[PDB]
Design an enzyme around this catalytic site. Structure first.
Site, short mmCIF file in Angstrom:
data_model
loop_
_atom_site.label_atom_id
_atom_site.label_comp_id
_atom_site.label_asym_id
_atom_site.label_seq_id
_atom_site.Cartn_x
_atom_site.Cartn_y
_atom_site.Cartn_z
N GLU A 153 0.89 -1.37 -0.01
CA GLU A 153 0.07 0.18 0.09
C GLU A 153 0.95 1.36 0.06
O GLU A 153 0.61 2.37 -0.67
CB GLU A 153 -1.04 -0.02 1.24
N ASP A 198 -12.04 8.57 -8.94
CA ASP A 198 -13.28 9.01 -8.36
C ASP A 198 -13.30 10.49 -7.39
O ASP A 198 -14.52 10.91 -7.11
CB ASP A 198 -14.09 8.08 -7.89
N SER A 205 -11.89 10.41 -4.49
CA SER A 205 -11.42 10.28 -3.08
C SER A 205 -10.04 10.38 -3.20
O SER A 205 -9.08 9.97 -4.16
CB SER A 205 -11.90 9.25 -2.65
N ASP A 248 -6.36 8.16 -1.00
CA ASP A 248 -5.91 7.18 0.19
C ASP A 248 -4.71 7.86 0.80
O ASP A 248 -3.79 8.36 0.11
CB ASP A 248 -5.40 5.84 -0.76
N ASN A 302 -9.14 4.92 2.71
CA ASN A 302 -9.75 5.84 1.66
C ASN A 302 -10.67 6.93 2.16
O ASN A 302 -11.70 6.67 2.90
CB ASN A 302 -10.45 5.13 0.51
#
Ligand SMILES: [Cl-]
Ligand SMILES: [Cl-]
Ligand SMILES: [Cl-]
Ligand SMILES: [Cl-]
Ligand SMILES: [Cl-]
Ligand SMILES: [Cl-]
Ligand SMILES: [Cl-]
Ligand code: NA
Length: 129
Positions: free
Chosen positions: A35, A48, A50, A52, A59
């Site tokens: 990640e 979209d 958003s 992270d 998120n």
């Protein structure tokens, strides 16, 4: 902060993630590896709108407030900036809610595609712990 592999394992265990909801420490270390490459300050924009955030790339669509994700929720009740701290407490507390949410660690797509079913114990191999 960029954690070392064992250093993060130790911090995760200290914050009670080791075997949380049945997921061994190596699962969590492997998730953080793919990640964020262990960097607490990692941020990445999703298609979209958003974003992270942090060591486990939580998120803003659901889990934290960044003020720029229309229609999103903040189920961890936290600014997304708190997820970038050198101290992992907020990221851990929030991950605990995410992994309890129904689909386990599959919520982390890198864990599903890169850690799930693998030899995750390698991630904690040699660590004192
Ligand atoms: Cl490593
Ligand atoms: Cl493990
Ligand atoms: Cl928002
Ligand atoms: Cl906030
Ligand atoms: Cl910490
Ligand atoms: Cl599960
Ligand atoms: Cl060690
Ligand atoms: Na949000």
């Amino acid at each position: 902060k960029v954690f070392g592999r064992c250093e993060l394992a130790a911090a995760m265990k200290r914050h009670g993630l080791d075997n949380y909801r049945g997921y061994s420490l190596g699962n969590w270390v492997c998730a953080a590896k793919f990640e964020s490459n262990f960097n607490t300050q990692a941020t990445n924009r999703n298609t979209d709108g958003s974003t992270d955030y942090g060591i486990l790339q939580i998120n803003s669509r659901w889990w934290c407030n960044d003020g720029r994700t229309p229609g999103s929720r903040n189920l961890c009740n936290i600014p997304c900036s708190a997820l970038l701290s050198s101290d992992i407490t907020a990221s851990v507390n929030c991950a605990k809610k995410i992994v309890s949410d129904g689909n386990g660690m599959n919520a982390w797509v890198a864990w599903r595609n890169r850690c799930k079913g693998t030899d995750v114990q390698a991630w904690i191999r040699g660590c004192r712990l």
